[PDB]
Nucleic acid binder design. Structure first.
Ligand SMILES: [Ca+2]
Ligand SMILES: [Ca+2]
Ligand SMILES: [Ca+2]
Ligand SMILES: [Mg+2]
Ligand SMILES: [Mg+2]
Ligand SMILES: [Mg+2]
Length: 759
DNA sequence: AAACGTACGCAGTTCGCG
DNA sequence: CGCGAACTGCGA
């Protein structure tokens, strides 16, 4: 089983290292024969003697071409002749790259920016995470002493907890009387003891939650301040910090650092992603949270530290439990893509597509297109195209609604119509498929590059969905529902990759052909169900639509819907298929992207409403939820109007807990890049002068107080709110939070804001 | 060195023009 | 002084 690959340099030569786990034993295989290379397209073969003489320099090393070789390849399915240029060290490629491209006889260069370790995995046909080997796992978490305005890791680490199959333990240097706590003398002894535990346990996988940005960087700064060699790698090395766009990433040589946070962010949809929220969302059970102020208070006063150790132990225990459930899913993704679990777990969906396309290109002798240059990148950014069809809904409260959905609409269109840049506007084909409105024709004689790969991906989704019904365990059901939704997003991201400005296989024509076909298929399906089956489409987005037959019972709508499904699916060709997704007793459609329906089991589902958004106060969400329940489940409009009146009364009388008035908004840039200033930005600028570091990703939690000026003038952070001296802006939360979230719903019954507010 | 798939959409905050 | 627009955050 291949776990990871990298390369080291021995006497100026690269040495590929393959970290493996075969027969329960860890092994490092070495390879000194793999040669870095990139391709070049020449105006004439006679010029190869000049390109061989082109040199460059990196550090104090002279870079030359080691060997050339003429190769017969394909570029988007067309025969092409390129020259394969070999080199000694992979770092020779970036040093000599542009000089070779700048030669007047070199048309272009190709495949010049592929990392050496990933190139090895592709060229040798190696698939990581392959086999039945059982990987040992060990999770850990840290608890630190934090104070406002201090530098990062200025205070010491207080506790280090770890968990595996043997249980969970906490190492700390203050005496805490608990059977799972090991007490040492100093912070240095604690870090050394944890380092020994890892060396003795020798886990293949180190599991963290946000270890890429906090736990590992905190341990590093603390180790260099205390002069500790943080030797965690199986080669005796220290954890290495890497840069991936905005955030950082930590790797441990010889092992797999599995950070759950990027995985959970791609797998589950939650309002907040604290460890306690993720744990309760997966295992249904609550987890207590202890904040850094209570940790610092308990440590410095010496009172209440058992509660802190319990929170630290549960942090490691829960992180291990979540790592166990989510590793096999990420391991399968590492097999589908063909890259190490470390990269696939934190990779964005764009690179998940491209890394697989790079592997498949090499398998089919297809020369890979280059990443766009600056001029082409800016050009791709400006241009856009039409997307999905969104119908202005029929507003009001409807009954006996069915939702009909297309099964993987965009992937089905790519396969059915062979939408691919190697088939777009090809010449000499016997059969073409022309996209509506945009007129792009596509060859059907042979399976296009991307379409020849989406079928298997869709097949795995149905295999997971089939096991997603035979299972009775809700835990297995949820994890399988999680995994199949992952495959749907990945398969759908193949369409988006066509419009991704950084995509190698960028195809704007392919992208708009997919959406143009999608718009035609749903518009046709809507017209058919209304003309030939007497339905009334109430709302429609990109791949699905709600509909009903007015003045008909639930049974009539169900049988007629199933009948229309037989009709329209016989007309729809290829992989285009409409499914019966659900029936709903009542439904409300506020506007585009804003709806709410209740199924026959009294379960309410909403789309786009304030109930889902995290930038709205809790009192507004709580109020909107109760209103929707009174309308969808009880059908009592006066009870819903009543509820809004009680809330506006309780707010006006200051009887609502200020906790439900907190507004959460994320800072999306540096505080200097803000052209306009709002309540959360104005508060964040106050938090900077108070000592809190503000950066993109920082969530600002503020509350609006009764006062003068703009809302930003009245906004203060919640941690500064004292209910003894501050009276919140009851008028603001009435007029700007509760009332707007419910007025657009209750307007369909004739009610205005004046009829709902308290007087 | 590596670099957030895509379009469509609502709505609060602020503030100057007419 | 109410409208519109620029800005902003987050929502298949
Ligand atoms: Ca739905
Ligand atoms: Ca689907
Ligand atoms: Ca907002
Ligand atoms: Mg690596
Ligand atoms: Mg003390
Ligand atoms: Mg663009």
């Amino acid at each position: 089983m291949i776990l990871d690959t990298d390369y080291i340099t021995e006497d100026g030569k690269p040495v590929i290292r393959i970290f493996k786990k075969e027969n329960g034993e860890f092994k490092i295989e070495y390879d000194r024969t793999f040669e870095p290379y990139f391709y070049a397209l020449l105006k004439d073969d006679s010029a190869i003697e000049e390109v061989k003489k082109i040199t460059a320099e990196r550090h104090g090393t002279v870079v030359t071409v080691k060997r050339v070789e003429k190769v017969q390849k394909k570029f988007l399915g067309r025969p092409v002749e390129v020259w394969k240029l070999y080199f000694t060290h992979p770092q020779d490629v970036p040093a000599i790259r542009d000089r070779i491209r700048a030669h007047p006889a070199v048309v272009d260069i190709y495949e010049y920016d592929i990392p050496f370790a990933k190139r090895y995995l592709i060229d040798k046909g190696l698939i990581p995470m392959e086999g039945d080997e059982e990987l040992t796992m060990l999770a850990f978490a840290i608890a630190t002493l934090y104070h406002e305005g201090e530098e990062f890791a200025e205070g010491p680490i207080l506790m280090i907890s770890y968990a595996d199959e043997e249980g969970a333990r906490v190492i700390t240097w203050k005496n805490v009387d608990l059977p799972y706590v090991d007490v040492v003398s100093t912070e240095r002894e604690m870090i050394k003891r944890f380092l020994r535990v890892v060396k003795e346990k020798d886990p293949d996988v180190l599991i963290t939650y946000n270890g890429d940005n906090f736990d590992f960087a905190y341990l590093k700064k603390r180790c260099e301040k205390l002069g500790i060699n943080f030797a965690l790698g199986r080669d005796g090395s220290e954890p290495k910090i890497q840069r991936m766009g905005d955030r950082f990433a930590v790797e441990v040589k010889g092992r797999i650092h599995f950070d759950l946070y990027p995985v959970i962010r791609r797998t589950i949809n939650l309002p907040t992603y604290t460890l306690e929220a993720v744990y309760e969302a997966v295992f249904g059970k609550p987890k207590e949270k202890v904040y850094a102020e209570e940790i610092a208070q308990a440590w410095e006063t010496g009172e209440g530290l058992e509660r802190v150790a319990r929170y630290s132990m549960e942090d490691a225990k829960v992180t291990y439990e979540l790592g166990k459930e989510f590793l096999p899913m990420e391991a399968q993704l590492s097999r589908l893509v063909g890259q190490p679990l470390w990269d696939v777990s934190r990779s964005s969906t764009g690179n998940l597509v491209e890394w697989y396309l790079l592997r498949k290109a090499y398998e089919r002798n297809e020369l890979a297109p280059n990443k766009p240059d600056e001029r082409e990148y800016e050009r791709r950014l400006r241009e856009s195209y039409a997307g999905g069809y969104v119908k202005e809904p029929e507003k009001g409260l409807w009954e006996n609604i069915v939702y009909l959905d297309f099964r993987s609409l965009y992937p089905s269109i790519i396969i059915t119509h062979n939408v691919s840049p190697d088939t777009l506007n090809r010449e000499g084909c016997k059969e073409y498929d022309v996209a509506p409105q945009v007129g792009h024709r596509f060859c059907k004689d042979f399976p296009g590059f991307i379409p020849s790969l989406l079928g298997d991906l869709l097949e795995e989704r149905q295999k997971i969905k089939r096991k997603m019904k035979a299972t009775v365990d809700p835990l297995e059901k949820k994890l399988l529902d999680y995994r199949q939704r992952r495959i749907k997003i990945l398969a759908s991201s193949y369409y988006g990759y066509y419009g991704y400005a950084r995509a190698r296989w960028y195809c704007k024509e392919c992208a708009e052909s997919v959406t143009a076909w999608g718009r035609q298929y749903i518009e046709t399906t809507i017209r058919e169900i209304e003309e030939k089956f007497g339905f009334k489409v109430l709302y429609a987005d990109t791949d699905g639509f709600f509909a009903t037959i007015p003045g008909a019972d639930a049974e009539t709508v169900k049988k007629k819907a199933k009948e229309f499904l037989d009709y329209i699916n016989a007309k729809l060709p290829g992989l285009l298929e409409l499914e019966y997704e659900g029936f709903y007793k009542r439904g409300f459609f506020v506007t585009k992207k804003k709806y709410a329906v209740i199924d026959e089991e009294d379960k309410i589902t909403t789309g786009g409403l304030e109930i889902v958004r995290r930038d709205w106060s809790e009192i507004a969400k709580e109020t909107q939820a109760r209103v929707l329940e009174a309308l969808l489940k009880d059908g009592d409009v006066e009870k819903a109007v009543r509820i809004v009146k009680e809330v506006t009364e309780k707010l006006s009388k200051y009887e609502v807990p200020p906790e439900k008035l907190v507004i959460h908004e994320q800072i999306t840039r540096d505080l200097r890049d803000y052209k306009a200033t709002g309540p959360h930005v104005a508060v964040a600028k106050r938090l900077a002068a108070r000592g809190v570091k503000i950066r993109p990703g920082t969530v600002i939690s503020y509350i609006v107080l009764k006062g003068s000026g703009r809302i930003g003038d009245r906004a203060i952070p919640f941690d500064e709110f004292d209910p003894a001296k501050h009276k919140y802006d009851a008028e603001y939360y009435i007029e700007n939070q509760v009332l707007p979230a419910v007025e657009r719903i209750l307007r369909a019954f004739g009610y205005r804001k004046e009829d709902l507010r308290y007087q």
